[PDB]
Design an enzyme around this catalytic site. Sequence first.
Site, PDB file in Angstrom:
ATOM      1  N   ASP A 191       0.798  -1.230   0.000  1.00 15.64           N
ATOM      2  CA  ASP A 191       0.000   0.000   0.000  1.00 15.64           C
ATOM      3  C   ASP A 191       0.825   1.272   0.000  1.00 15.64           C
ATOM      4  OD1 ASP A 191      -2.397   1.719   0.925  1.00 15.64           O
ATOM      5  OD2 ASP A 191      -3.224  -0.326   1.088  1.00 15.64           O
TER       6      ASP A 191
ATOM      7  N   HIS B 106      -3.775   5.758   4.234  1.00 11.16           N
ATOM      8  CA  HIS B 106      -4.437   4.586   3.674  1.00 11.16           C
ATOM      9  C   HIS B 106      -3.793   3.278   4.113  1.00 11.16           C
ATOM     10  CE1 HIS B 106      -5.908   1.952   0.327  1.00 11.16           C
ATOM     11  NE2 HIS B 106      -6.978   2.714   0.438  1.00 11.16           N
TER      12      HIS B 106
ATOM     13  N   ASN C 245     -14.353   0.564  -6.192  1.00 13.10           N
ATOM     14  CA  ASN C 245     -15.439   1.390  -5.655  1.00 13.10           C
ATOM     15  C   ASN C 245     -16.160   2.160  -6.760  1.00 13.10           C
ATOM     16  OD1 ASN C 245     -14.455   0.845  -2.786  1.00 13.10           O
ATOM     17  ND2 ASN C 245     -12.906   2.378  -3.316  1.00 13.10           N
TER      18      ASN C 245
ATOM     19  N   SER D 122     -11.274  -0.897   0.157  1.00  8.04           N
ATOM     20  CA  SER D 122      -9.916  -0.981   0.671  1.00  8.04           C
ATOM     21  C   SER D 122      -9.909  -1.407   2.140  1.00  8.04           C
ATOM     22  CB  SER D 122      -9.189   0.358   0.569  1.00  8.04           C
ATOM     23  OG  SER D 122      -8.741   0.641  -0.739  1.00  8.04           O
TER      24      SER D 122
END
Length: 274
Positions: free
Chosen positions: A32, A63, A154, A220
């Site tokens: 990530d 994130h 998404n 996520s």
Amino acid sequence: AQTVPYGIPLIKADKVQAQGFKGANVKVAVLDTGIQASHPDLNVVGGASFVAGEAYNTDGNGHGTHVAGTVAALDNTTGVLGVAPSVSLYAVKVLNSSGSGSYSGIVSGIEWATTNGMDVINMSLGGASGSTAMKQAVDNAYARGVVVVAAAGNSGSSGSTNTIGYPAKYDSVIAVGAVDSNSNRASFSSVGAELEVMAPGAGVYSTYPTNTYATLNGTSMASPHVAGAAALILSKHPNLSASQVRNRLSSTATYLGSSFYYGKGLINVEAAAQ
Ligand SMILES: [Ca+2]
Ligand SMILES: [Ca+2]
Ligand SMILES: [Xe]
């Protein structure tokens, strides 16, 4: 002092944890935007950065830190609680500070994981397009015994339109959608034939730089729940193969409706780890 995000009991991670299985000695790589290794509620064992100018143990976005906390925030008297709190956590930086990254950096992160012997790979990232090499990398890791998990996407629903992204669309990868605390599909959750399972992805509370905690929405957020569950399944049945862990998760899932929208349904770690 320690908060328990709704997603832990929703997927029944608390019951496996109660039995004494908390992911000890299982290695999970979080691919990530990195991880704030200094966060008091996290313990990063190692990692690698394939992003120029940024180290692996820092996270300028948030994130990566949030996702990691969902997989393994430490079981103590502070902050939050991860799905698999005793796991060996590795930060593999493939996305920069702005949350983007090249396919080659991503592919290099996947191969790194593979080579360093990870048991689970979490990819809370997606693209509209995949590539030869990327499919190559996830196919080999899967064939090599790694459980590859990714965020489905998404972009929501658009008629019978398949909105699943890469690398979740590859059959060697578990595509995970998002539900809310009511077990209903999140409107942003991508849909399509490859959707495999659902996990909490809306209003998820986790670790966030610097030394704090925040709430995010996204597939996520769901992915790490499944990466964590896989870790718990392995801590209990160190014997299982990657395919078997995968089968356990989709086969025991709670049905919520049409596969195009929910895959096999919401995961249930207690059942899958029988
Ligand atoms: Ca904690
Ligand atoms: Ca897939
Ligand atoms: Xe994503």
